[PDB]
C-alpha cells in the first residue's frame, strides 16, 4: 500500500481544509482516523472550548499514549488541527473546517456527498451493477495486475498501469506484467491494491480538469451518501463526473447504462471506504467460492478455484494443469522462488495466505488457531500458528534470493553521557523499538518513535 494517509499528509494545508468543508468528507476521514483520535475528534468536535493538554492528560488511563502520540502527529501531519502555543501548553483546537465539518455530519447534516445522494427507484440492487463492476474490476485486474485475459473496459486503467506503476510490465507497449509496484499492490488484501492504483488516477489527472479536491470530494461523495437516483450523474463534479464517467467506463464507479444514469449501488466503493465483505453473466457465488492451497506436506490441494484467483497463485507456484476442481502445483523452496527472482520479496505472500485464499484453508487453520487467547496463559504449546515451517521455508529461500539483509530507520548521535543511552535502551527492550544498541559507539539505526517520546518529556 502507498499509505495514502501518509500521502495525504504531504499535500499542503489549504487543500486539506478544502476537503474538510464537506461534512460527508469529514465523516469519511473520521472513519480512518485512529480510534484514540476518534475519541479526541468527537470530544473536541462537540465542545469547542480551548483546554490545555494537561487536562486531556488527566482524562486517559496509564500507558497507551503511543496511540495519542501517533494520533496528534497524524493530526498535525494532515493538518486537521492547528497547534496553538498559548500558555506554554498545547491548546489543541480542531481545524476550523474539520471542527465545523463534523458538526453537520454527526448531527444529520447536509454533507455534499451525504445529502447529494438521490433517493429514487434503485433498480441497481446489491447484485445490481456490482457484478459488472466486479467484472470490470476483474478485467482491470487481468490487465493491470496481470492475468490470462485483460478484458478491462478502462483504457485509462491500462495507461495508469504503465506510467503510474499500476502494472509491472511494458507500459509503452500496452502490457500489464507483475513487477515491484504490482507485487506490492497485489500483496495488499484489498486496500493496498485499491489505494495504490487509485493514486495514479488522482496523481496523473490532477491538474487539468482533475480538480484534486473536487475529484476527492466526489470519491468521498460516493461514500458520503448512497447515490441512488441521479447519483453517479449528479454526485460528481467536473473532475468527479469525468472521474465518475471514467470510473463508470473504467469500473471505478457502478453507474447505470449509457455512461449517464443514476448511481447503482456497486460494492467496489463500499469495499474501499467501509473495508468490509469483498464478495459481490449473472452468477455471483461466494463467499467461500474462492480459495487457495497450503499444506505441511509441501503440496497444494485445491478443490474450489476461480478464473483470476489461480492466475495470482500461479505467479508464485508452478502451474501445470487445471482440472474440474484441482490445479497442479507443489509448494517448495523452488515454488516461491519463481517470483523471488523478479525481485518480489516473499513478505506479502505470508500475509496473503492468511488473509486471502484462506476460504479453502478454513479447516486447515481450524486446527491451527485452537483459541489460543484465553488458554494462552494456561497452555503455551502452539498448534502451528502462524505457520512457522512454511515461514522457515520461505525465509530460507527469500534470504537466498537476497543474501543481504537491510534494515530501515535513522541513525542518532549526541549520546555524550552513558546514562542516557542505557536508560532508553532498557525501555526500548520493553517496547522493542531498538533493533540493536551499543554503549561503545553510542549510535543506533531505528525510527523516530524512541527519539520523539524522550524529547516529549524533555519538552513537556
Amino acid at each position: 500500500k502507498h499509505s495514502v494517509t501518509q500521502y495525504l499528509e504531504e499535500i499542503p494545508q489549504q487543500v486539506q481544509n478544502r476537503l474538510y468543508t464537506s461534512p460527508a468528507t469529514c465523516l469519511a476521514i473520521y472513519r480512518i482516523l485512529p480510534p484514540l483520535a476518534k475519541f479526541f475528534i468527537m470530544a473536541m468536535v462537540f465542545n469547542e472550548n480551548e483546554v490545555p493538554l494537561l487536562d486531556l492528560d488527566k482524562w486517559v488511563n496509564s500507558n497507551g499514549k503511543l496511540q495519542f502520540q501517533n494520533a496528534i502527529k497524524s493530526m498535525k501531519s494532515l493538518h486537521l488541527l492547528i497547534p496553538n502555543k498559548s500558555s506554554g501548553t498545547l491548546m489543541i483546537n480542531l481545524n476550523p473546517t474539520f471542527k465545523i465539518s463534523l458538526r453537520n455530519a454527526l448531527t444529520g447534516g447536509e454533507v455534499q456527498n451525504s445529502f447529494g445522494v438521490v433517493v429514487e427507484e434503485n433498480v441497481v440492487s446489491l447484485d445490481l451493477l456490482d457484478e459488472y463492476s466486479a467484472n470490470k474490476w476483474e478485467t482491470i485486474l487481468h490487465f493491470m495486475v496481470g492475468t490470462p485475459l485483460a478484458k478491462i473496459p478502462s483504457e485509462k486503467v491500462l495507461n495508469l498501469l504503465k506510467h503510474s506503476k499500476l502494472m509491472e510490465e511494458v507500459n509503452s507497449t500496452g502490457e500489464f506484467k507483475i513487477t515491484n509496484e504490482g507485487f506490492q499492490f497485489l500483496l495488499q488484501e484489498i486496500n493496498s491494491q485499491l489505494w495504490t492504483l487509485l493514486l495514479q488516477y488522482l496523481k496523473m489527472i490532477e491538474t487539468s480538469k482533475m480538480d484534486l479536491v473536487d475529484v476527492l470530494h466526489f470519491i468521498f461523495m460516493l461514500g458520503a451518501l448512497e447515490v441512488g437516483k441521479a447519483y453517479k450523474i449528479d454526485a460528481l463534479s467536473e473532475t468527479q463526473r469525468i472521474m465518475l464517467q471514467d470510473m463508470r467506463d473504467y469500473g471505478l464507479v457502478f453507474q447505470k447504462h449509457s455512461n449517464d444514469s443514476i448511481f447503482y449501488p456497486t460494492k467496489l466503493a463500499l469495499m474501499l471506504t467501509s473495508d468490509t465483505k469483498t464478495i459481490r453473466g449473472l452468477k455471483n457465488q461466494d463467499i467461500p467460492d474462492g480459495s487457495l492451497i497450503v499444506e505441511t506436506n509441501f503440496k497444494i490441494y485445491s478443490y474450489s478455484n476461480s478464473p483470476l484467483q489461480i492466475a495470482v497463485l500461479s505467479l508464485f507456484v508452478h502451474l501445470k494443469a487445471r482440472f474440474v476442481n484441482m490445479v497442479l502445483g507443489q509448494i517448495t523452496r523452488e515454488s516461491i522462488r519463481r517470483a523471488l527472482t523478479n525481485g518480489i520479496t516473499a513478505d506479502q505472500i505470508i500475509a496473503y495466505l492468511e488473509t486471502h485464499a484462506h476460504p479453502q484453508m478454513r479447516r486447515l487453520a481450524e486446527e491451527k488457531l485452537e483459541k489460543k487467547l484465553e488458554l494462552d496463559p494456561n497452555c503455551k504449546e502452539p498448534l502451528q500458528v502462524l505457520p512457522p515451517t512454511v515461514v522457515d521455508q520461505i525465509r530460507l529461500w527469500q534470504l537466498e534470493l537476497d543474501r543481504v539483509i537491510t534494515y530501515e530507520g535513522s541513525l542518532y548521535s549526541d549520546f555524550e553521557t552513558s546514562q542516557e543511552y542505557n536508560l532508553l535502551s532498557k525501555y526500548a527492550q520493553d517496547i522493542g523499538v531498538l533493533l540493536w544498541k551499543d554503549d561503545k559507539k553510542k549510535k543506533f539505526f531505528i525510527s523516530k518513535e524512541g527519539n520523539s517520546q524522550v524529547l516529549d518529556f524533555a519538552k513537556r
Binding site: K299, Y303, F323, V324, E367, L396
Partner: protein, 634 residues
C-alpha cells in the same frame, strides 16, 4: 514367463482432465472427494464414513497424499490382489466409494474397483480329497479351473481320490485356491506352465498352501516354538498370509534388520515342511543368523548357513536351512558345493523359500532355479517398492499375491522410531570450499567437502546435545581416513573404517547400554551387511551412495527400533552437508527422498550456540583449507 505385470501396476492410473473430467455428482452431498482420474480419495472432515472409506481404500489402494485436512491416493496396480483378499465387494467398493467420495466413480475406476473387489484377488481354484482339482471355489472358478490349459487340460476326469490328492495334488497345484469345491484332480507335470497361464490372462488368485495334504513331503524336524518376538507389523503379515485355515505364498516387503525373517520362520513353523531362507549375500547369512537368530527358536545347527567358502552339512538336513541367492545361483559360486545344493533341491520337494532383499540379486536367476528346483511355494520378504526385478516374470505373481506392505510410516511412528525428525545440516561455507568447487568438479572432491570442520562441530552439537538428552547418535561416513581423524579430537570411542569387530561392538557396548559414549561413526562397512543399531540420531555424511534404491534400504536399515520415549523427538536424523559445494544436488535428492518416504522433515542450520561449543579445532577458515589438502590423499 510365470509372472504378470498386474502385481506391479503401481505408479500409473493418476491422470484426469477438467473439460474431459466429469464433475462429481456426490460433490453436492458427499463428505470426501475420491476422483478416479488422479487416483485419490480426498477424505474431508465432513464424511459420515471417513474412516470406512480409508479402510476400504487402504485395503484396495495406496494413499499417496497424507494431509491433515484432505488426503490423496497413489496408483496401486497390485492393490487389486490385496483388495480382493481384504473382502471389499466389487460393486460394494464402488458403491460406497462413489457415494462417500465426491468425485463420481468413473467407468475405469468403477470397472477396476469392480474388478479389484471381485476379479482382482478373487480367482477360483478347486481341490478335492485334500489335493488340487480342476475347479474353483465359486461357479466361475469351476469354469476357470476346467478352462485352464494346465488346470483343465492336464486334469484327470476323476473328481477326487485319496491317493492322488495326497500324493499328486499341470503339476501338483499347492498354490491353488480354497479347496472343498467342485473340481477334478490334475496331472503332475508343469506347474511352471500352470503359473505361466495364470499370469498371461492376468488372474490374481487367492492362493492357499495345504501342507497337511502333501504326502510326498514328510514332516521335517522343526522345533516348533513361537517364543521369538512378535511385533505389530509381524502378526498381520502372519495373519494375512494365513487368513482362514491354510496359509499361502506371496510378497511381504518388510524392514530389513527388524526381524524381517521372523514372520517367515514362524510361518515355517506352522507349515511343518521343507523351508529354506535366502539372504542378500553369503556374508549376511552368518552375520544375520548370529545377530538375532540365537534368541529365535530356529535351530542354528540344522539351519546350515550356506556360504560356499565355509562348509557345513548339506543335502543331509532333516529340517530347515538358511542361505542366500548368491549361494543359490550367481557368479558367487565359490565351489561346486552350491551347485550340489541346487541338484538336491530338485530331488527334494522344497515347499517354502524365504527371500531376504531379493532386489540386490537380479531376478533372472530366480526363474532359472525355480524350474529345476520344482518348488511348491515361496516368500519374497523384500524391502523396496521400486526394483530392477520387475522383469517379464514378476516375483509377486511368481510367488503369490501380496498380503502386507512395508508401511514405514507405521513403524517409524508407533514407538520404535517414532517422531522422525529428519534434518539436513548446511554447514556454513568458506573460501576453500568455494575454491575447491570451482577448481575441480570430479568425484574425487567427494571427500573434499566432507572434511568440513564445522560439519564435525555441527556433529559435535549433536554429540553434546544427545548425550545430555540420553539419546543415541549415529554417524554415517563411507570414508575411512578422514572419518578416523574426526572423533579423536573429541576423545571418545567411535566406529571407523575397518574397525576391529570386537572393539566396535565394544564401542556399541558403551553406545546403546551406556550413555557417556553415544556417538558412532558407521562407515560403508555397515552395509551390506552388519548389525543395524538402534537409532535415535542418525548422521549421514556421504550423500551420493549410489544408487537411490540402496538409499531406501540404507535409510530403512540404520534407522532402527529405539525403545526409548523420553524426548518428544525420539528419532533424529541429520544430513551434514557442506553448502555451496558439490553435495547440493545429492543432498537435495535426500531432502525430497525423506519427505517422499513419509518421514517428518526439518532443516537444522542454526545450532544453539554454535561458536561456543567445545573442541573449537579448525574453526577458523585458514585451518579448514589445510585439512582439505590432506583429504586430497584420499
Amino acid at each position: 514367463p510365470a509372472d504378470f505385470v498386474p502385481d506391479s501396476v503401481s505408479g500409473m492410473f493418476r491422470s484426469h482432465d477438467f473439460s474431459y473430467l466429469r464433475l462429481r455428482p456426490d460433490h453436492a452431498s458427499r463428505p470426501l472427494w475420491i476422483s478416479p482420474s488422479d487416483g485419490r480419495i480426498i477424505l474431508e472432515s465432513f464424511s459420515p464414513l471417513a474412516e470406512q472409506a480409508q479402510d476400504f481404500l487402504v485395503t484396495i489402494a495406496e494413499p499417496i497424499s497424507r494431509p491433515s485436512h484432505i488426503h490423496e491416493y497413489k496408483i496401486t496396480a497390485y492393490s487389486l490382489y490385496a483388495a480382493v483378499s481384504v473382502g471389499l465387494e466389487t460393486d460394494d467398493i464402488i458403491s460406497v466409494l462413489d457415494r462417500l467420495s465426491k468425485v463420481p466413480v468413473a467407468e475405469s475406476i468403477i470397472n477396476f474397483i469392480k474388478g479389484a473387489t471381485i476379479s482382482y484377488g478373487k480367482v477360483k481354484l478347486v481341490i478335492k480329497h485334500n489335493r488340487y482339482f480342476v475347479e474353483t471355489t465359486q461357479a466361475d472358478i469351476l469354469q476357470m479351473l476346467l478352462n485352464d490349459s494346465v488346470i483343465g487340460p492336464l486334469r484327470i476326469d476323476s473328481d477326487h481320490q485319496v491317493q492322488p490328492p495326497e500324493d499328486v495334488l499341470e503339476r501338483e497345484e499347492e498354490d491353488d485356491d480354497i479347496d472343498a469345491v467342485h473340481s477334478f484332480e490334475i496331472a503332475n507335470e508343469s506347474v511352471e506352465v500352470v503359473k505361466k497361464r495364470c499370469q498371461e490372462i492376468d488372474y490374481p488368485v487367492l492362493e492357499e498352501y495345504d501342507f497337511r495334504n502333501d504326502h510326498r513331503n514328510p514332516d521335517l524336524d522343526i522345533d516348533l516354538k513361537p517364543s521369538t518376538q512378535i511385533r505389530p507389523y509381524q502378526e498381520k503379515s502372519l495373519s494375512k498370509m494365513f487368513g482362514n485355515g491354510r496359509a499361502r505364498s506371496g510378497i511381504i516387503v518388510l524392514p530389513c534388520g527388524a526381524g524381517k525373517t521372523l514372520v517367515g520362520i514362524t510361518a515355517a513353523c506352522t507349515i511343518k515342511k521343507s523351508v529354506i531362507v535366502l539372504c542378500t549375500s553369503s556374508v549376511s547369512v552368518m552375520q544375520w543368523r548370529q545377530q538375532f537368530l540365537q534368541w529365535c527358536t530356529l535351530q542354528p545347527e540344522n539351519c546350515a548357513v550356506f556360504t560356499s567358502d565355509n562348509k557345513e552339512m548339506f543335502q543331509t538336513e532333516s529340517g530347515l536351512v538358511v542361505s542366500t541367492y548368491s549361494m543359490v545361483a550367481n557368479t558367487r559360486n565359490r565351489s561346486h558345493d552350491s551347485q550340489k545344493v541346487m541338484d538336491f533341491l530338485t530331488g527334494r520337494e522344497w515347499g517354502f523359500i524365504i527371500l531376504d532383499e531379493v532386489h540386490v540379486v537380479p531376478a533372472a536367476m530366480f526363474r532359472r532355479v525355480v524350474s529345476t528346483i520344482a518348488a511348491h511355494a515361496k516368500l519374497g520378504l523384500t524391502a523396496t517398492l521400486v526394483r530392477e526385478d520387475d522383469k517379464i516374470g514378476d516375483l509377486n505373481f511368481l510367488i503369490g499375491p501380496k498380503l502386507y506392505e512395508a508401511n514405514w510410516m507405521e513403524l517409524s511412528q508407533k514407538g520404535h522410531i517414532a517422531n522422525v525428525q529428519c534434518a539436513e545440516v548446511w554447514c556454513p561455507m568458506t573460501a576453500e570450499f568455494y575454491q575447491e568447487y570451482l577448481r575441480e568438479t570430479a568425484r574425487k572432491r567427494m571427500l573434499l567437502y566432507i572434511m568440513n570442520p564445522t560439519k564435525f562441530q555441527a556433529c559435535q552439537f549433536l554429540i553434546q546435545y544427545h548425550e545430555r538428552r540420553g539419546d543415541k547418535i549415529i554417524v554415517f561416513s563411507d570414508n575411512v581416513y578422514a572419518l578416523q581423524e574426526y572423533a579423536l579430537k573429541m576423545g571418545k570411542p567411535f566406529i571407523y573404517g575397518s574397525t576391529p569387530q570386537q572393539e566396535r561392538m565394544n564401542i556399541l557396548q558403551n553406545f546403546q547400554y551406556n550413555d557417556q559414549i553415544n556417538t558412532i561413526f558407521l562407515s560403508k562397512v555397515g552395509d551390506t551387511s552388519i548389525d543395524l543399531p538402534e537409532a535415535t540420531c542418525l548422521i549421514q555424511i556421504s550423500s551420493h551412495y549410489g544408487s537411490r534404491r540402496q538409499e531406501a534400504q540404507r535409510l530403512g536399515r540404520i534407522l532402527r527400533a529405539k525403545r526409548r520415549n523420553d524426548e518428544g523427538f525420539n528419532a533424529f536424523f541429520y544430513s551434514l552437508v557442506s553448502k555451496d559445494t558439490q553435495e547440493m544436488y545429492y543432498s537435495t535428492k535426500r531432502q525430497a527422498f525423506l519427505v517422499d518416504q513419509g518421514y517428518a522433515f526439518k532443516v537444522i542450520t542454526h545450532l544453539h550456540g554454535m561458536e561456543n561449543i567445545p573442541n573449537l579445532a579448525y574453526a577458523s577458515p585458514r585451518e579448514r583449507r589445510e585439512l582439505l589438502q590432506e583429504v586430497l590423499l584420499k
